[PDB]
């Protein structure tokens, strides 16, 4: 598969408000993807985790979703 950072632009990892780009780090469910799927660095993923959780509290990113399969 492709990795998220690979197919993307130059973005602000600290901006909790940019949903169009943060939605690209969630799964089909609301889960935050592992580094093996985001292609981020140790320091970056730690920062992404916090910024997505920030967006979740503003109602911009979901906490959990429903899987349409199985």
């Amino acid at each position: 598969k492709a990795k998220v950072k690979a197919t993307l632009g130059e973005f602000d990892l600290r901006d909790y408000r940019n949903v169009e780009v943060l939605k690209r780090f969630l799964s089909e469910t609301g889960k935050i993807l592992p580094r093996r799927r985001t292609g981020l660095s140790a320091k970056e993923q730690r920062i992404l985790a916090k910024t997505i959780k920030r967006a979740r509290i503003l109602g911009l990113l979901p906490f959990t979703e429903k899987l349409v399969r199985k």
Partner: protein, 116 residues
Amino acid sequence: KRQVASGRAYIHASYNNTIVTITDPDGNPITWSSGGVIGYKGSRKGTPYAAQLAALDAAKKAMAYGMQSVDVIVRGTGAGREQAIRALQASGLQVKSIVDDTPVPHNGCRPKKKFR
């Protein structure tokens, strides 16, 4: 007596039983079956067969109120969780979609020693 003809089907599948509820689009139920509703009594209810016959018992009960379209919702891991789905597709009820909505806590409540 209702003529709903479109709605939801919830499969609650545990290791001790598989039980199927059928509701209208708003969520309010119509009919339902389970492993105990059909003749099975003990551990047999949590079998894929009982899962099948339960799914089909409610699927024919819903034909009475005129159901055709069905949206499937699944909660729990269980024997015959899949077998009740596979039964539901062949029930004549045209299956609109399938969703797995099994509730997972964010580690909030202390489980019983059985799950520890």
